[PDB]
């Protein structure tokens, strides 16, 4: 087509979605991790994660207001990834890299899994 | 902080939100324009438009599944702006610029209003 494009549009949209999350506006699901609860927007979770995409396209699960993650999932690893989903920023540190990679593999967040693999390979 | 950032994350999220819109997945509102109906996600509309932000933060309207726009709003102008919201691409043409600018002013989409003003000023 002959469209023009606003370079900062996608980033501005994501920033506003994160402001709605902060203020708990129109959040439609609670993700439960080892008795730690995280409120979010189903559409953002689906846009970022192959696991949430499969969950919320399921005819029965699409209607659930609570999703319980596998007990092996670490709440801090989930929190870091949820922050990444809404900001593009990943708080990757020596002390959390193993939990973050394991959570990203479970959530099916391929780009996060890739950088964790590379950061681990550099330290060996 | 000491975060790393994935450059293409915001664009990838928006692209996936547009794929959900195409497939009518988790759309939670119908916008009615001069008897033309457009399905969308309330959170994306709020992230892009000052008007939808005000509408869906209102305690009564946040719960509506149908929103009727002012009868002076042109459906094509709305369609072009809805596409912009989900893609960052604006199909601005000599034949639609007046309808697009009037719709962007009503929807409170300041960056769109700005480029329409500049494109109109260049043609005078």
């Amino acid at each position: 087509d002959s469209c023009i494009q606003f370079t900062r549009h996608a980033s501005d949209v994501l920033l506003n979605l994160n402001r709605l999350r902060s203020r708990d506006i129109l959040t439609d699901v609670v993700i439960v991790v080892s008795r730690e609860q995280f409120r979010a927007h189903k559409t953002v979770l689906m846009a970022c994660s192959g696991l949430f995409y499969s969950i919320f396209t399921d005819q029965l699960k699409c209607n659930l207001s609570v999703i319980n993650l596998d007990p092996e999932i670490n709440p801090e690893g989930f929190c870091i990834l949820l922050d990444f989903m809404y900001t593009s920023r990943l708080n990757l540190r020596e002390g959390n890299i193993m939990a973050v990679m394991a959570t990203a593999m479970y959530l099916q967040m391929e780009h996060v899994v890739d950088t964790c693999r590379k950061f681990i390979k550099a330290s060996e | 902080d000491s975060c790393i950032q994935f450059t293409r994350h915001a664009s990838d999220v928006l692209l996936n939100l547009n794929r959900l819109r195409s497939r009518d997945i988790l759309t939670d509102v119908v916008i009615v324009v001069s008897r033309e109906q457009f399905r969308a996600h309330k959170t994306v509309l709020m992230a892009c438009s000052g008007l939808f932000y005000s509408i869906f933060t209102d305690q009564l309207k946040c719960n509506l599944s149908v929103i009727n726009l002012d009868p002076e709003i042109n459906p094509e102008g709305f369609c072009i702006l809805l596409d912009f919201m989900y893609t960052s691409r604006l199909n601005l043409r000599e034949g639609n610029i007046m309808a697009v600018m009037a719709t962007a002013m009503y929807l409170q989409m300041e960056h769109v209003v700005d480029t329409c003003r500049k494109f109109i000023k260049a043609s005078e």
């Binding site: 469209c3 023009i4 494009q5 606003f6 370079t7 | 691409r89 604006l90 480029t115």
Partner: peptide
């Protein structure tokens, strides 16, 4: 704004 840019030409994509």
């Amino acid at each position: 704004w840019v030409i994509p």
